[PDB]
Motif scaffolding. Sequence first.
Motif, short mmCIF file in Angstrom:
data_model
loop_
_atom_site.label_atom_id
_atom_site.label_comp_id
_atom_site.label_asym_id
_atom_site.label_seq_id
_atom_site.Cartn_x
_atom_site.Cartn_y
_atom_site.Cartn_z
N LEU A 163 0.82 -1.23 0.00
CA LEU A 163 0.00 0.00 0.00
C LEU A 163 0.85 1.28 0.00
N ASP A 164 2.03 1.26 -0.59
CA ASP A 164 2.98 2.41 -0.51
C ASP A 164 2.42 3.63 -1.26
N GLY A 165 2.32 4.76 -0.58
CA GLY A 165 1.71 5.97 -1.13
C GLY A 165 0.17 5.90 -1.18
N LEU A 166 -0.50 4.89 -0.59
CA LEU A 166 -1.98 4.72 -0.67
C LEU A 166 -2.72 6.04 -0.29
N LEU A 170 -5.46 9.63 -3.95
CA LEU A 170 -6.74 10.30 -4.36
C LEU A 170 -6.66 11.76 -3.89
N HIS A 171 -6.29 12.65 -4.81
CA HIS A 171 -6.11 14.09 -4.54
C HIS A 171 -7.45 14.81 -4.71
N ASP A 172 -7.74 15.65 -3.74
CA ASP A 172 -8.92 16.53 -3.68
C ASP A 172 -8.71 17.73 -4.61
N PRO A 223 3.62 21.21 -6.39
CA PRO A 223 3.41 22.13 -7.50
C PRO A 223 2.79 21.41 -8.69
N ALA A 224 1.86 22.12 -9.33
CA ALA A 224 1.15 21.63 -10.53
C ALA A 224 0.76 22.80 -11.44
N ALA A 225 0.60 22.50 -12.73
CA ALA A 225 0.16 23.44 -13.79
C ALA A 225 -1.36 23.36 -13.97
N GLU A 226 -1.95 24.46 -14.42
CA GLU A 226 -3.32 24.51 -14.95
C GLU A 226 -3.22 24.91 -16.42
N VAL A 254 5.95 17.33 -9.65
CA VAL A 254 5.24 18.41 -10.39
C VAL A 254 4.24 17.76 -11.33
N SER A 255 2.98 18.14 -11.17
CA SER A 255 1.86 17.77 -12.07
C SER A 255 1.84 18.75 -13.24
N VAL A 256 1.82 18.25 -14.48
CA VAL A 256 1.67 19.12 -15.69
C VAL A 256 0.61 18.54 -16.61
N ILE A 290 2.32 13.30 -15.28
CA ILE A 290 1.62 13.77 -16.50
C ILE A 290 0.13 13.70 -16.18
N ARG A 291 -0.56 14.83 -16.29
CA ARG A 291 -2.03 14.96 -16.06
C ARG A 291 -2.77 15.05 -17.39
N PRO A 292 -3.45 13.99 -17.88
CA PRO A 292 -4.52 14.15 -18.86
C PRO A 292 -5.71 14.82 -18.16
N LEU A 328 8.61 9.27 -13.49
CA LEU A 328 7.45 9.44 -14.41
C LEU A 328 6.19 8.76 -13.84
N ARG A 329 5.19 9.55 -13.45
CA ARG A 329 3.82 9.06 -13.10
C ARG A 329 2.75 9.73 -13.97
N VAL A 330 1.50 9.28 -13.79
CA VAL A 330 0.23 9.79 -14.39
C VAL A 330 -0.75 10.08 -13.25
N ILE A 355 -0.95 -0.37 -10.64
CA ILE A 355 -1.79 0.75 -10.13
C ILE A 355 -0.87 1.79 -9.48
N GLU A 356 0.39 1.47 -9.22
CA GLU A 356 1.33 2.48 -8.65
C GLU A 356 1.73 3.48 -9.75
N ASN A 357 1.42 3.16 -11.02
CA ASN A 357 1.57 4.09 -12.16
C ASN A 357 0.60 5.27 -12.03
N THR B 7 -7.79 29.58 -2.16
CA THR B 7 -7.52 29.16 -3.55
C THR B 7 -7.04 27.69 -3.55
N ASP B 8 -7.02 27.06 -4.73
CA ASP B 8 -6.40 25.74 -4.92
C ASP B 8 -4.89 25.88 -4.62
N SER B 9 -4.37 24.96 -3.81
CA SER B 9 -2.93 24.82 -3.52
C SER B 9 -2.10 25.15 -4.77
N1 LIG Z 1 2.84 14.56 -1.43
C1 LIG Z 1 4.01 13.64 -1.37
C2 LIG Z 1 3.73 12.21 -1.86
C3 LIG Z 1 3.82 12.10 -3.38
C4 LIG Z 1 3.33 13.37 -4.14
N2 LIG Z 1 2.30 13.16 -5.24
N3 LIG Z 1 1.45 14.03 -5.52
C5 LIG Z 1 0.42 13.88 -6.35
C6 LIG Z 1 -0.32 14.99 -6.59
C7 LIG Z 1 -0.56 16.05 -5.70
C8 LIG Z 1 -1.24 17.16 -6.24
C9 LIG Z 1 -1.66 17.26 -7.61
N4 LIG Z 1 -2.37 18.31 -8.09
C10 LIG Z 1 -2.86 18.49 -9.34
O1 LIG Z 1 -2.71 17.82 -10.37
N5 LIG Z 1 -3.68 19.51 -9.55
C11 LIG Z 1 -4.08 20.50 -8.55
C12 LIG Z 1 -5.44 20.85 -9.03
C13 LIG Z 1 -6.48 21.49 -8.37
C14 LIG Z 1 -7.63 21.67 -9.08
N6 LIG Z 1 -7.75 21.28 -10.32
C15 LIG Z 1 -6.81 20.69 -11.00
C16 LIG Z 1 -5.58 20.45 -10.36
C17 LIG Z 1 -4.29 19.81 -10.85
C18 LIG Z 1 -1.42 16.18 -8.45
C19 LIG Z 1 -0.72 15.08 -7.94
C20 LIG Z 1 0.29 12.65 -7.28
C21 LIG Z 1 1.45 11.69 -7.12
C22 LIG Z 1 1.17 10.25 -7.50
C23 LIG Z 1 1.06 10.03 -8.86
C24 LIG Z 1 0.85 8.73 -9.33
C25 LIG Z 1 0.71 7.65 -8.44
C26 LIG Z 1 0.83 7.89 -7.10
N7 LIG Z 1 0.72 6.85 -6.27
C27 LIG Z 1 0.83 7.02 -4.95
C28 LIG Z 1 1.06 8.30 -4.37
C29 LIG Z 1 1.18 9.38 -5.24
C30 LIG Z 1 1.08 9.17 -6.62
C31 LIG Z 1 2.33 11.96 -5.89
O2 LIG Z 1 3.28 11.26 -5.63
#
Ligand SMILES: NCCCCN1N=C(c2ccc(NC(=O)N3Cc4ccncc4C3)cc2)C[C@H](c2cccc3ncccc23)C1=O
Lengths: 463, 463
Positions: A163-166, A170-172, A223-226, A254-256, A290-292, A328-330, A355-357, B7-9
Amino acid sequence: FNILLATDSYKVTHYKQYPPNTSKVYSYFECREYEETVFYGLQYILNKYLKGKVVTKEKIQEAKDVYKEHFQDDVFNEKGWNYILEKYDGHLPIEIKAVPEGFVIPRGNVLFTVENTDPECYWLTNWIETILVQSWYPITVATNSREQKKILAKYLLETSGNLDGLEYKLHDFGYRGVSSQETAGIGASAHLVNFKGTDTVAGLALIKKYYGTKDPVPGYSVPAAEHSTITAWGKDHEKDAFEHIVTQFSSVPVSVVSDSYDIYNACEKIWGEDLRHLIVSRSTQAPLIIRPDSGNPLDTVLKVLEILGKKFPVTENSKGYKLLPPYLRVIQGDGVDINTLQEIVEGMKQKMWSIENIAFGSGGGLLQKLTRDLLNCSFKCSYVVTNGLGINVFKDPVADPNKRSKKGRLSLHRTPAGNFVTLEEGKGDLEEYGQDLLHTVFKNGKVTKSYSFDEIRKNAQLN
Amino acid sequence: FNILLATDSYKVTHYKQYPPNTSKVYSYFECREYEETVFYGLQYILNKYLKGKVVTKEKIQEAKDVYKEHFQDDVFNEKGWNYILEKYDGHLPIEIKAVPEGFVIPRGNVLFTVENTDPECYWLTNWIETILVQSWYPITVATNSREQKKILAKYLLETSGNLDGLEYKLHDFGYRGVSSQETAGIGASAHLVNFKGTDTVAGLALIKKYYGTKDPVPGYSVPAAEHSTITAWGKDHEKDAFEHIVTQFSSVPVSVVSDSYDIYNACEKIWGEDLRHLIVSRSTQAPLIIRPDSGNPLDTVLKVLEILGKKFPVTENSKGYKLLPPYLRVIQGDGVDINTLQEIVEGMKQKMWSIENIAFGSGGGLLQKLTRDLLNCSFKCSYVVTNGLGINVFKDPVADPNKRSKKGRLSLHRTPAGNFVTLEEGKGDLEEYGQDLLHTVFKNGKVTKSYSFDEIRKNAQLN
Ligand SMILES: NCCCCN1N=C(c2ccc(NC(=O)N3Cc4ccncc4C3)cc2)C[C@H](c2cccc3ncccc23)C1=O
Ligand SMILES: NCCCCN1N=C(c2ccc(NC(=O)N3Cc4ccncc4C3)cc2)C[C@H](c2cccc3ncccc23)C1=O
Ligand SMILES: [Cl-]
Ligand SMILES: [Cl-]
Ligand SMILES: [Cl-]
Ligand SMILES: [Cl-]
């Protein structure tokens, strides 16, 4: 805020509807008839809205004046509210007993009870239904967020073997997707019962003030892009935007978002060829995510991965499942609810992708596309005393056995196989089932039992 | 409240992502292509959240401290927010232009535009996306409430031959079934754009403080029973509860839930025989409103009316449709949304029942079972100035054409045929159409243009 103004209009009139010489109204909350629900959110309501001096001369007169014009008659109970002010210095003479916050309770059990502690205030118990029943929402978010944790845990365990990173998977995203600032905080707090990844900032200050954590904040972002920060470079410069962004955030994850024009080109040609050199150099502690953000969620994730698997070194992990390099993640952050999160993991697993992808962002799925409907959250009278005779009170609609209410004084008990049962008709006082699991949380204007956000997290853990 | 925390992080990180030498970000809000949507709610947000000194030394330091823990890094733009404090006494250097509130604009048109007024605050435009985009909710409630008014109007006109009492035919019941207090007020205020009948009291104080009405209050209620006030009398005293309740409220209208045990018995035997005598005596200004609250909504309403038609004197009105005597009406309060409200009136019309027989109460349907996805409420960057040169910016995802964004500087225009057009690429400045229907509502920390709740009501009328 004025609690005299924080009820359904008709409840204003209810003190003229109860049998005469009614000394006690006693009412319970259940999730009527998602086999199990996280109890969370009551303590917020108790502190922010119910505790301390809640009635003042000004609050009585404001209510009097509004209800006089709202009903076009003086049906407001001024005498009843003036009694609260002069007897109890405005402190509600209510006793609320509740199961501990975070508790994972099967459907159709008593989670809390409300009752008046002063016969004059018989009418007060159901005055605070409306405010108390807004609990449905923290409960509902916490339950649906946890259900999603379960699916992610099932497929992660199956395809990685841990369950590493479980609790970051799921990001809010739901800050814009909700009906209000107050709603953002409570919703984002309910999701953080299960996960540590949020963009809904308002949740953090609520948990600090109302629950508490030993850590500085209960939730984290990267950090992430919009679309604004990519498309502002111009339709001809997507590569320049990406390159600036990965380089500005070289040392952190970084999410892009990569779907501005052509997700499949951005993955294959821009990330996979022209900028491949800026990604494969990055730390295991700071991947590109990478964010689709558009198209069929399942089809897009599967083509994104197939493209990325062909431009990057893919590992086969212990389970026979494929894995991107750790830089590299999605994250699929669009159209994600419990149903589509489940379509994707199952689709990824049928294509032999770990699923860790994948990470998930949900906005509306997690925080807005929920009703009191979903878990049948419901507050009903079960017991009243009229003329000194306790009587067991319930609804039992002809056309809906699902809406039957529970009878009389309620307690929650552990069965010998260690399951939950709500005893009815005060049968809890026959000590056949040990002691009542509900605790006094509120009595006579005071919070009498409270839980750290850490305790609630512990209570809410998955099997 | 702290706008630096509101705002969003990821937007905290955005000021390091935009092309360098960017002096202006310009962004618009649309309901992207429920054919027409009531704009209401922006003014609330502008007054409660955006106006005046929103930045202080303490609010910068609080944000710095939270974001330090939240990002595990100091990515916060302290310099940018200190500039706002020291240049503008904390007043946002933003210009928001908006369509007048109550304006009913077809889908896919600019409703509001956000731009920075100082090159240094390029980043501030989209800082306030999250907060501004919560407007989806007041807009969606107002639009969904209005579309339901349209269906009510259609069937009332077809079966009675007027719209008498239309503004009291859809009652707001949704106070317990929304996610918070703040959300109740906003949602209930959005419904009162179209109707006058509410139990969601919190909407009253919001309209008073933010919008204003010539009348004391924008919304009205009557005394009405809940399951607690019927069932409290004892399973075998339903008749005593009814009789006490209608006698307490003899001279005013009174809603009485009648499904506590058996709706069909209570209509036929208890209202229709035992207590018949206290119903047929009641004034036309104070009828009994029998509330069923269970069963198939359509099937229940149809048998309720058939029972009542056989115990009470029914007239056929000028259209050939049947009418209860004026002392006797019905309210379906349970499972009511736009789709079931439509199933019922169409079912009632097929059984030759006038729509003036039936009122509707909606809780979840009205205030919570709504998403940002329903009208595609969306805020996007369309124009930026980089190195002094304006460029027209947009998204255009290959695999979702309907998420394509508008390019460049936007204006809203009346067509020759009295419809709307949104002009792109700054084509508004050709004045080949009349003039821009968006007006300055917010500039440099001030609300510059406001609308009474009455003006909004007028604008939001049906045809
Ligand atoms: N925080 C430290 C632990 C690791 C950090 N991390 N963060 C992750 C994350 C954190 C914020 C964001 N944010 C956005 O994309 N936004 C903000 C936002 C707000 C409103 N509208 C659109 C957007 C786009 C995206 C990804 C995903 C990412 C990870 C990606 C794959 C698989 C994983 N599996 C397990 C654990 C994480 C895993 C991850 O590692
Ligand atoms: N000020 C005068 C307005 C008119 C008076 N009036 N009031 C009406 C009404 C007013 C409040 C209530 N309230 C409840 O039932 N609650 C409160 C509530 C809150 C949360 N959950 C559940 C409930 C149950 C019910 C009905 C229906 C009723 C009418 C019934 C038929 C058809 C009509 N057509 C047109 C115009 C009204 C028509 C009506 O006439
Ligand atoms: Cl985005
Ligand atoms: Cl979303
Ligand atoms: Cl009820
Ligand atoms: Cl409802």
